[PDB]
Amino acid sequence: FGKTGDAEKVLNGGWNYLMETFNSYANPGYGAMLRANDAMGSDVVLNSKYGFRTHNEFSAIYGKGGTNTLSWLLAYRVINDCNGVLDNIDAAEGTQADRNRIKGQALALRGFLYLHLASCYSFAIDKDPDAVCAPIYTQSTETIAAEGKPASSVSEVYAQSINDLEEALELIPETYVRDAKHKIDNEVVLGILSRACLYARQWEKAKTYSDKLLAKDNYLMTESEYKAGFNSVDNKEWIWGHAQTNDQSNASYQFHYLDTTTKGSYYYSFNVDPYFRDLFEDGDYRKEMLFWATDPGADVESAAYVWMRNSKFRFRDIENQLGDIVLMRVAEIYLINAEAKAHLNDPDAINKLNDLKTARGAKTIHTNLSQQDLLETIWLERRKELWGEGFSLIDIIRNQQTVVRNAYPEGPIDYIYTDQTHTLKKKTQGHRFFNFPDKSAFCPNSKYYLYRITDSEELANKNLYKDHPKLSIYTK
Template sequence: MKNLKYIFALGLGLFASSCKETLEVNPQDQIDAGNALTNITGVNSLLSTVYANLRGAGHYGANYKILPDIMADNIYPIPGLNSNRLIQESVNAPRAHFAPWGFYTGGINTANLVIDATGKVEGTDAQKNRILGQAYGLRALFYWDMVKVFGYSPMFPVGSNNLGVPIITTPTTTAAGVTFPKRNTVVEVYTQIEKDLLAAEAILDNSVTAPFYMSKVAVQAILSKVYLYWGKYPEAASYADKVIQARGNTFVSGADYTGMYYRDSNPEAVFEIAFQLVQSLGNTGLQSLYAQFPADYSKRQDQAAFDNNAEPKTGYGDFTPTPELLALYEPGDVRRGTITTARKSNTVVNYVRKHTPTQGNNFLQNVVVFRISEMYLIRAEANFRAGTSTGASPQADLDKIRLRAGLASVPVSIPAILKERRIELAFEGDRWFDLVRLGMDVPKTTALGSIAAINYNTDYRILAPLPIAELSVNPNLVNNAGY
C-alpha cells in the first residue's frame, strides 16, 4: 500500500467516472494514503483530503450551491450578457443535472479508509474519536448529497422506484477489492446516514469552535435537516433546537445582515467549507458566477463602482434573480440588500452579493453549508407539522426571522414558513431540494419564456442520471427511468 494515493480508485470498476463527474482536488490536498495509514498523525492528515473534496466545483465549491437555484426558479442567465455557462441546466435539458458519482472516490472511499485505519493505529481514545467522528459525519454528508439527486424524496416515492445509491462502508484499496453493488433503497441510504451521524454525535464535542470542522453541533445541524427531509418532524425539531441552544448567539442582527456575507468567516456559520488562496476556484467559483466585482478589492462594497461601467471588474456575473423571486421581497426587507444593481456592458443588471470576495482576494470566500438562521426555520416547520413547540413555538421562530428582516409578524403556516425559507436561503443552494423533498413540481421563471414546470411525479428530470461509465462496468446498477 506504500504507493497508494487517495485518488487510487479513479478508473477502477465501480469508481470509474468521467472527467466531468470526478471531483478535482488541488495537488496540495492529496495525501499519500499508504504512508498516512501507518500512524494517527497520518490518518488525521488523510482526513483532510475528505474535506478537500467538499471544495470541488462539482460539490459545494459551485454546483451544489448554484444549481438548486438555476434548475428551479430563483435565478436565470442574464439574457445576452452571460458566458454560456450552465445554460443547459437553466432549461433543465436532458442529462444537464447534478453529477456527484465522483463522491465515491475522494469523499466516501477516503472516509472509509480513515474509519478503517483509525481502529488499527496507536492513539488515545480522544484522538481516535475526534477523527472517527469527523469521518462518520463527512461520509454521511456525501451520501446525503448523493441520495437527494439520484433518488426520490423518502416521503414521496414515485411508483415502484425507491432506489437511492449503493451503500459502501468498507474501503477499496486494490483492483481486486472492487465490488459491483446494486443500488440500495432511499430509506436504506437515509438509515445509513442517520447511523453515521448518530455515531459521530456520540463521540464528538464542540471544543473546536471553528465552523469549518465537523463538530458535534455541525453533525446535529445535518441531522436536523436530514430528519426534516425524511418527514421525522419531532426529531428535526429536537436537533434544530440543540443547534440553537449551542449557537443561537451567532444569529446576526438586521443591521449586520448584508455585512455578514463580507466577513472572512460568516458569523452565522454552523458548518462551512474553508478555502485558502491555493484552493480558490477563480472564475469557476460562486463569486464569479453570481456577480462581477470591482477589480480593486477595496471597492468590493462600493456601489458606485458597481454602477460605473468604466470600472474594471472581475468575474463573469452570469446569473440574476428571477422576477418571481424579486416579487416576494416585501418593502423594507433587509435581505433585499444582498441583491444590488450594477452595470455590465453598460446595461443595468441585478447581481447577487452573498458570495463575495473576502480574505483580501477577489476569488476567495468560505462556503457556508449550514447557518443558524436555517435552524430556526427548520424548528418552525418541524414543530408546526408535528404540532409541537420544542424549544419555541413555530410562531416565535417565524417571527425571529421576519422581525430581524424588518418585517411585521404574520400568522404562522406552512406556506409562510416556506416563503421565508425561499427568501432567507435564496442563492444558498436550497430551492430545488426544498421543492423536491415535498414532492412538489419545480416551476420555471417566465423570464426564460414558456417553459413548463417539471412535474415531480411524471418528469424523469427530477432525478439525475447515473454515469454511463458506471453502468457499463457494473451490471448490477439500474439507471433512473428516462435516461
C-alpha cells in the same frame, strides 16, 4: 497510516478534494452542485455567460453533463476516504479521545455525502420510499464491491446518513473544540442531523436535534454582517463553511457566477427573478439588496439591459479572487426547527419563523395558519433567506413542489446609477426558461429535477439495478 494524525491527514485531504476539485472551470468543487441546485429553481435567472445557463434550462443534469459527473466522483471518492479512516482509526496510535473524535468526524462526513445522494438522486422519500437511489459502501473501495454493489433505495440511503450522523454525535464530545469553520464538531453534527432528519421526514428527530443546536447557538447575524458579501467563515452565524486563501483558492472561482455586482467578476450570471423581490415586505433589509443594474464592469451607456442583481454574494478579495463558501448557517436551523414543528403540530413553529423574520425586518405572522399554509410560509422564507446557498432544487424535490417562473416585461424603465448619479432608459430582463426542454410544463416530480447515476457506473456496475429498478421515466 499509523497514528491518529495520519488518519486526520487523510480526512483533511478528502475534505479538500470535496471542496476544491474542478471539473472544468464550470464546476468548482462541491459548490458547483449548490449552484446547479439554485439554477434549477424558481428564483434565479441565468445570463448567457459560461457556466450554468444549461442548468437554468434543466438540460445540464438530466443531460449527464460535467456537474452530474463531478457529483458522483466527489461523493464516492470522499466516501472512500472516510471509509479508509474508519478501517484504520481503531488501530491508530494516540489518545482514545482522538480516536473517538476522528472516527466521529469520518462518520459525519460520510453521512453528509449520503445525504447528498439521498436528497438529489431520487424523488421524495414519501413519493416512492423504495425507489432506486445509489450504492452504499461502508468499507474502503469486499468481494461484493469489486463486481458491482446494487444501488440501495432512497429510504435506505437516508437511513444510512442519519445512522452515520447519530453515531458521530455520540463520538464527538460536546467539549471538543474545533479550530476552524470547516471542521466538524458536536454543533456541526447536530446541524447536519437536523437537515437529514427533516429531508427524511423524521420530524421528531429533526425537532430534537435542532432544539439541541439552538440551545447551544441561536445567533442571527446583524444587517451589516448580512450585507458584508457572504464571503468569510469568520461570520458568527456560519456553522460550517470552507475558507479560501491564495494557497487554497479553487472554490472561490464560483464567485464569478454568484457575484453579479463587483467589477472584475467574470460571468455575473446568477441573477434574480425580478418577481422574487416582491416576496419581501418593505422594511426587510434583504429587499434592499435586490436591485436593477447593468453588467458589472460594462459601459453603462453601451448596455441594452439591466438584470436584477443580488448584492448578497461578493468576492472578498477581487484582485486575488477569494471568497469563502458557506455550507450551513444558524438561520437554516431556525427554519428546520420551524418546519419540523409545523409537521408535528407544535405551536412553537411560528415563534421560530418569527424570530428569523424579526431579525431581518420582515413582517411577523400574527394569524394562525393551517398546517399546510404554515408549511408554505416556511418554504417561502427558506427561498427568501437561503437564496443562492444551494437549496432551491432540494426543496422542490423533497416537498414535491413545482418550479414556477413568470415572464417579466422588457420595459424600458428609468435606470438610476452612480459613476455622482445619472439616469438612462434600459430594458429589464427576467426569467428566460419557462418550461422543460421537451416543452413539458413545469410540474412536480419531473425527470428533469434528478441527478443521475453516471454512464460509467451503469457499465461498470453489472448489479446496479438488481434490487431496485431504474426509473421507467428514463427512455435512455
